[PDB]
Amino acid sequence: KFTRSRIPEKVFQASPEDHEKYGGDPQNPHKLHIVTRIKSTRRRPYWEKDIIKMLGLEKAHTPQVHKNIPSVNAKLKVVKHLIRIKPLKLPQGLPAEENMSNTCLKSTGELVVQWHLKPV
Amino acid sequence: ARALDLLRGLPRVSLANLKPNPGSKKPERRPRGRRRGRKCG
Amino acid sequence: GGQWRLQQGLAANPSGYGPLTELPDWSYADGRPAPPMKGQLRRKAERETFARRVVLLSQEMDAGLQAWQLRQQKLQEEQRKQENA
Amino acid sequence: IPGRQWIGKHRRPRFVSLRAKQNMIRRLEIEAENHYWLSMPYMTREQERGHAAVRRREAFEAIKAAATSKFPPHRFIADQLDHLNVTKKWS
Amino acid sequence: KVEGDIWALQKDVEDFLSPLLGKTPVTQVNEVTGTLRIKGYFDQELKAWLLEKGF
Amino acid sequence: LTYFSARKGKRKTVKAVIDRFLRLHCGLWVRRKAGYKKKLWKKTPARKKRLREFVFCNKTQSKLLDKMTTSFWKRRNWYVDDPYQKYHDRTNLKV
Amino acid sequence: LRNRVTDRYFRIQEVLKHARHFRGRKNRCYRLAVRTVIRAFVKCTKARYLKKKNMRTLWINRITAASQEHGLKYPALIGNLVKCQVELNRKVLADLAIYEPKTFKSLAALASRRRHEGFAAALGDGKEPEGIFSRVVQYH
RNA sequence: GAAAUUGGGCGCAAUAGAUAUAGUACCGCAAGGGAAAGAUGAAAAAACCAAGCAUAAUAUAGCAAGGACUAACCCCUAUACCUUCUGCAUAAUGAAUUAACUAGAAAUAACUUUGCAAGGAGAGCCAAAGCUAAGACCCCCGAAACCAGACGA
RNA sequence: CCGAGCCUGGUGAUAGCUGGUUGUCCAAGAUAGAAUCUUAGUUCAACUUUAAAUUUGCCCACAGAACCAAAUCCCCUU
RNA sequence: ACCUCGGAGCAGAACCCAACCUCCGAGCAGUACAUGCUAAGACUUCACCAGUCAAAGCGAACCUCAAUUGAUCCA
Ligand SMILES: [Mg+2]
Ligand SMILES: [Mg+2]
Ligand SMILES: [Mg+2]
Ligand SMILES: [Mg+2]
Ligand SMILES: [Mg+2]
Ligand SMILES: [Mg+2]
Ligand SMILES: [Mg+2]
Ligand SMILES: [Mg+2]
Ligand SMILES: [Mg+2]
Ligand SMILES: [Mg+2]
Ligand SMILES: [Mg+2]
Ligand SMILES: [Mg+2]
Ligand SMILES: [Mg+2]
Ligand SMILES: [Mg+2]
Ligand SMILES: [Mg+2]
Ligand SMILES: [Mg+2]
Ligand SMILES: [Mg+2]
Structure with missing residues (x-):
C-alpha cells in the first residue's frame, strides 16, 4: 500500500564534504530557517496538505521564518520535497525597534536591517 | 427619556414610516433562480 | 533571465525588491513627495511582521537555552546538597 | 494504440527528453540541500522542552476568549428612529 | 424593566460581575426595549445586588 | 403518522409508542429491553439481570x-x- | 392570473441587444440568442488571458525579427540586456525596434558587447578582472 | 376514535374567470365528449413593437462567436444547450421558432424577534424561565389497471 | 385498437419508474458501513450544513502493544 | 449452489476490511443447582436492536466449551 515514509537518520547526517559545498558550520549552526514552498500540495497525500498549513506555506514563493529545533525539523522532514530550506543569515544583527521598519529579506537569504534604495 | 426628545426633529410617524424589528421577518425561500431552485431542494 | 539575478543577490523577478518597485512612481512638480503607494504600505507592513517574527523566534530560543542552562545547574546542586550529614 | 492511449495494458510510450531529465535534476539539487540544512539543529530535543509553552498557552487563550464572546450586538434607539427619516421632506 | 440610562447600568454590572467571573461578562443592551442580556446564570447574584441599590 | 386528521385536523399519535415507552419530562424516553421474558432458561444470570x-x-x-x-x-x-417521580427533573447537567 | 409578468419585453431586450450583430436567427429568436450571448460573454472573459499571451508572442516575434537584422538571436539579446541591468520589457523593446531603430541598434550593440564579455570571461577561467560593461551596480 | 362535560372583495379581465357568445357548432349508433371567438368614435344620418417575410440572394474556413483591426471576412483562440450519468461534442434524451400559459401547498420541536414574567394566555392549555404572538421548511405531468352504474347486436 | 367493449363516476387512482421543476449575487460543501421480499428504494450511522456552548484538536518522542514487509496505534514537546 | 452464527488465510505488526474467494466448523453436550440478589466503571461486531465484562456491597460457601442461536404482537 502507499503509506507515510520513515526516512532514516543516516540521510540527515551531513558529511564533511557537504560542509564544503554548502557554506554551513557544524559547530555553531544557524538558528532560523527560511522555508519557501516550491511544489504544490495537490497530488500529494493529506498528511502533507496539512503540514503545509501548519507551517504557513499555503502560498508558493512566500518565505517564512521557522526555528531550527528538532520538532519543527520533524515537520520539515515530511514535506522536504515541497519546500526549499535555507538559513536566515544575519550580517548585521537582529533588528532593534528603531530598525524594525527598514528591513529587507534578500534572495541570498540574508536580512539586511538598513534598506535604502541608493547605490553604493 | 431622551428618545422622546429625538422625535421632535424627526418627521411624523405615519403608515409610510413603519418598519418591523430587524430579525423578526425572515425572507421567504421560494424556488426561483439558479441557487434556490433547479431541483428545488 | 532570473538565474543570473539570483547570483548577484537581486530578486529573481525584477518586480521584487530593489529600486524599480520600491521607489515612488511619481512626485509633485514643485517637489513635494507623493503619498506612499498602497502596495508599498502593504509590503512594508508585511516586512515588519516578518522582522518581528525574526526578533520573536530568536529570543524564544535564547531564553529557552538559558532555562535549560539553569535547569541543568539546579539539577547539579541537588546532587551535591544531598551528599552530606 | 488500442484504447485510451495512456491507460491500460497497451499504452502509447512516453519518453524522457533533455527537458524532463534536467527538470528532475535541478529539483533533486534543491532536495539535497534540504537534507543538509535539516542535519544540524540548534537545540537538542531536551533543551527545546517547554521553551515556548508560555506563548503557546496564551495563543489558545485568545482563541478561546474569542470563541466564548459570541453574543448578539447592541440595539440602539438611534437605529430604530432613523427609519423615520424616509419621509423627511422639504417645506 | 430598565428605564433611564441602560449604558450606566451595563457598566455597573460589568464592574459587579467581573470579580465574580474573573473576566468581564459579555452583555448586550437593547436600548429600544430597555433590557440587558448578560451571558451566564447570575439570577440570584443580580437580584440581591439590585435590592441593595433599592430598586 | 397522521399529521392532519380528517375529523379534527390535528396530529394523531402512534399508539404503539405509548404502550412501549415512558417519557420523562426532562426529555428522556425509558424502555424495557427486548427479549427480557424470552428464553430465560438458556441465559446466564448476568445476562438475565441486564434484560x-x-x-x-x-x-x-x-x-x-x-x-x-x-x-x-x-x-x-x-x-x-409515581415511582418515576424523581426522574422527571434533571439535576446537575453541564450540557 | 393574479399577477403575471408585465415587463417580459425588457428582459428579452437585455439579451437581444447583445445579439444584434449575429447571424441567422441568433439575432432575433430569444431561445437561440441566450445560448450564444452567454457564450459570447464567456469568450469575452476567457480572452483576457489570451490577449496578454498573444501580445507577448507578438512582441517576441517583433524583437526576434529586428535582432536578426543585427545578427543577434532573441535569447542573445534579452539574456544580455538583463546582465547590463537594462530592465526594458518586451513592449518597449518591440516599440523601440519599429519607431526608434537607432536606439534599437544601440541595444543590439550593447547586448552583443556584453555577450562577448561573457565569452571572454568564460574562456579565460581563473581570476581575471571583469569586463567594462559586465560590472554590476549594487544597491544597498 | 368517542362521550360525560363546556357553551361585500390586498377575486379574475377574452389562453384568465363558468365549458359557455353554448351545452350550441362539431364528434359518436348510443350513453357521452365538447369547442373557438369580440375590441373605432361624442356622432358611421361623420403610425413605433414578436416570429415570418419584403426592402436588400451569395465569395475559400468550419458551434457561427470572441480577441481584435484602418477594414465586414481573411489572422489567432474556442468540442451548442438541457437532462442523465463513473464519465456526453457525443452518432444518448428533449427541443422548428415566436407569443401566452405551465410546477414547493404544512406539523409538533427548535431558531429569530417582541409582550408579560414564577407566571403566561381574551376560560379549555402549558409552566422546575416560562408562556403568548409573529416570521421562516415540505412540487408538476404520465401508466397498464381495479370497481360501481349506464349505453351499445 | 377485445386475454375481455365503450362511456361516465370513484379519480388530481397509484407509480421506489422516466421526464420537467422559472429572478440576481456570495459562502460552506464528495464515497466508512449496517439492516431490509433489499441491493433502481429507504431507515440508522458516517460525511456535509447552520446556530450555540465550551476546551482542547491536529502534528506528534522517549517508553509501550504475542505467542504460535511498507507502516500503524499510543504520544508530551513543537 | 446459496441466505444465520463461529475459527483460520487474503487482511504479516492497533482496530476495520470485500468476494458465486480459499479452508474448517456450529444449531449441542456435560457438570453444577447461591447457574442467588444487587451495583461503580467500561467493551461493543462499524447504526439501532441486541451482545459482552465487572470491583465494591447483601447473602451464602470455606460453570466448562470459539459458535452452540430467533425480536415484537398478550395471550
Ligand atoms: Mg433549468
Ligand atoms: Mg482509443
Ligand atoms: Mg359532546
Ligand atoms: Mg374562456
Ligand atoms: Mg420582425
Ligand atoms: Mg479559423
Ligand atoms: Mg469530453
Ligand atoms: Mg444529440
Ligand atoms: Mg432517459
Ligand atoms: Mg427530435
Ligand atoms: Mg342484426
Ligand atoms: Mg401521480
Ligand atoms: Mg466555494
Ligand atoms: Mg427499487
Ligand atoms: Mg496529543
Ligand atoms: Mg458500537
Ligand atoms: Mg464480589
Whole structure:
C-alpha cells in the first residue's frame, strides 16, 4: 500500500564534504530557517496538505521564518520535497525597534536591517 | 427619556414610516433562480 | 533571465525588491513627495511582521537555552546538597 | 494504440527528453540541500522542552476568549428612529 | 424593566460581575426595549445586588 | 403518522409508542429491553439481570418518538405515588 | 392570473441587444440568442488571458525579427540586456525596434558587447578582472 | 376514535374567470365528449413593437462567436444547450421558432424577534424561565389497471 | 385498437419508474458501513450544513502493544 | 449452489476490511443447582436492536466449551 515514509537518520547526517559545498558550520549552526514552498500540495497525500498549513506555506514563493529545533525539523522532514530550506543569515544583527521598519529579506537569504534604495 | 426628545426633529410617524424589528421577518425561500431552485431542494 | 539575478543577490523577478518597485512612481512638480503607494504600505507592513517574527523566534530560543542552562545547574546542586550529614 | 492511449495494458510510450531529465535534476539539487540544512539543529530535543509553552498557552487563550464572546450586538434607539427619516421632506 | 440610562447600568454590572467571573461578562443592551442580556446564570447574584441599590 | 386528521385536523399519535415507552419530562424516553421474558432458561444470570432493566433511548430515538406523540404526553404529571417521580427533573447537567 | 409578468419585453431586450450583430436567427429568436450571448460573454472573459499571451508572442516575434537584422538571436539579446541591468520589457523593446531603430541598434550593440564579455570571461577561467560593461551596480 | 362535560372583495379581465357568445357548432349508433371567438368614435344620418417575410440572394474556413483591426471576412483562440450519468461534442434524451400559459401547498420541536414574567394566555392549555404572538421548511405531468352504474347486436 | 367493449363516476387512482421543476449575487460543501421480499428504494450511522456552548484538536518522542514487509496505534514537546 | 452464527488465510505488526474467494466448523453436550440478589466503571461486531465484562456491597460457601442461536404482537 502507499503509506507515510520513515526516512532514516543516516540521510540527515551531513558529511564533511557537504560542509564544503554548502557554506554551513557544524559547530555553531544557524538558528532560523527560511522555508519557501516550491511544489504544490495537490497530488500529494493529506498528511502533507496539512503540514503545509501548519507551517504557513499555503502560498508558493512566500518565505517564512521557522526555528531550527528538532520538532519543527520533524515537520520539515515530511514535506522536504515541497519546500526549499535555507538559513536566515544575519550580517548585521537582529533588528532593534528603531530598525524594525527598514528591513529587507534578500534572495541570498540574508536580512539586511538598513534598506535604502541608493547605490553604493 | 431622551428618545422622546429625538422625535421632535424627526418627521411624523405615519403608515409610510413603519418598519418591523430587524430579525423578526425572515425572507421567504421560494424556488426561483439558479441557487434556490433547479431541483428545488 | 532570473538565474543570473539570483547570483548577484537581486530578486529573481525584477518586480521584487530593489529600486524599480520600491521607489515612488511619481512626485509633485514643485517637489513635494507623493503619498506612499498602497502596495508599498502593504509590503512594508508585511516586512515588519516578518522582522518581528525574526526578533520573536530568536529570543524564544535564547531564553529557552538559558532555562535549560539553569535547569541543568539546579539539577547539579541537588546532587551535591544531598551528599552530606 | 488500442484504447485510451495512456491507460491500460497497451499504452502509447512516453519518453524522457533533455527537458524532463534536467527538470528532475535541478529539483533533486534543491532536495539535497534540504537534507543538509535539516542535519544540524540548534537545540537538542531536551533543551527545546517547554521553551515556548508560555506563548503557546496564551495563543489558545485568545482563541478561546474569542470563541466564548459570541453574543448578539447592541440595539440602539438611534437605529430604530432613523427609519423615520424616509419621509423627511422639504417645506 | 430598565428605564433611564441602560449604558450606566451595563457598566455597573460589568464592574459587579467581573470579580465574580474573573473576566468581564459579555452583555448586550437593547436600548429600544430597555433590557440587558448578560451571558451566564447570575439570577440570584443580580437580584440581591439590585435590592441593595433599592430598586 | 397522521399529521392532519380528517375529523379534527390535528396530529394523531402512534399508539404503539405509548404502550412501549415512558417519557420523562426532562426529555428522556425509558424502555424495557427486548427479549427480557424470552428464553430465560438458556441465559446466564448476568445476562438475565441486564434484560430486567429500564434503559434510556438514543438522541435520535428520542427525537423520533417526540414527533410520534402529541403534546399531551409532554406535560407535567403530578401523580400520587409515581415511582418515576424523581426522574422527571434533571439535576446537575453541564450540557 | 393574479399577477403575471408585465415587463417580459425588457428582459428579452437585455439579451437581444447583445445579439444584434449575429447571424441567422441568433439575432432575433430569444431561445437561440441566450445560448450564444452567454457564450459570447464567456469568450469575452476567457480572452483576457489570451490577449496578454498573444501580445507577448507578438512582441517576441517583433524583437526576434529586428535582432536578426543585427545578427543577434532573441535569447542573445534579452539574456544580455538583463546582465547590463537594462530592465526594458518586451513592449518597449518591440516599440523601440519599429519607431526608434537607432536606439534599437544601440541595444543590439550593447547586448552583443556584453555577450562577448561573457565569452571572454568564460574562456579565460581563473581570476581575471571583469569586463567594462559586465560590472554590476549594487544597491544597498 | 368517542362521550360525560363546556357553551361585500390586498377575486379574475377574452389562453384568465363558468365549458359557455353554448351545452350550441362539431364528434359518436348510443350513453357521452365538447369547442373557438369580440375590441373605432361624442356622432358611421361623420403610425413605433414578436416570429415570418419584403426592402436588400451569395465569395475559400468550419458551434457561427470572441480577441481584435484602418477594414465586414481573411489572422489567432474556442468540442451548442438541457437532462442523465463513473464519465456526453457525443452518432444518448428533449427541443422548428415566436407569443401566452405551465410546477414547493404544512406539523409538533427548535431558531429569530417582541409582550408579560414564577407566571403566561381574551376560560379549555402549558409552566422546575416560562408562556403568548409573529416570521421562516415540505412540487408538476404520465401508466397498464381495479370497481360501481349506464349505453351499445 | 377485445386475454375481455365503450362511456361516465370513484379519480388530481397509484407509480421506489422516466421526464420537467422559472429572478440576481456570495459562502460552506464528495464515497466508512449496517439492516431490509433489499441491493433502481429507504431507515440508522458516517460525511456535509447552520446556530450555540465550551476546551482542547491536529502534528506528534522517549517508553509501550504475542505467542504460535511498507507502516500503524499510543504520544508530551513543537 | 446459496441466505444465520463461529475459527483460520487474503487482511504479516492497533482496530476495520470485500468476494458465486480459499479452508474448517456450529444449531449441542456435560457438570453444577447461591447457574442467588444487587451495583461503580467500561467493551461493543462499524447504526439501532441486541451482545459482552465487572470491583465494591447483601447473602451464602470455606460453570466448562470459539459458535452452540430467533425480536415484537398478550395471550
Ligand atoms: Mg433549468
Ligand atoms: Mg482509443
Ligand atoms: Mg359532546
Ligand atoms: Mg374562456
Ligand atoms: Mg420582425
Ligand atoms: Mg479559423
Ligand atoms: Mg469530453
Ligand atoms: Mg444529440
Ligand atoms: Mg432517459
Ligand atoms: Mg427530435
Ligand atoms: Mg342484426
Ligand atoms: Mg401521480
Ligand atoms: Mg466555494
Ligand atoms: Mg427499487
Ligand atoms: Mg496529543
Ligand atoms: Mg458500537
Ligand atoms: Mg464480589
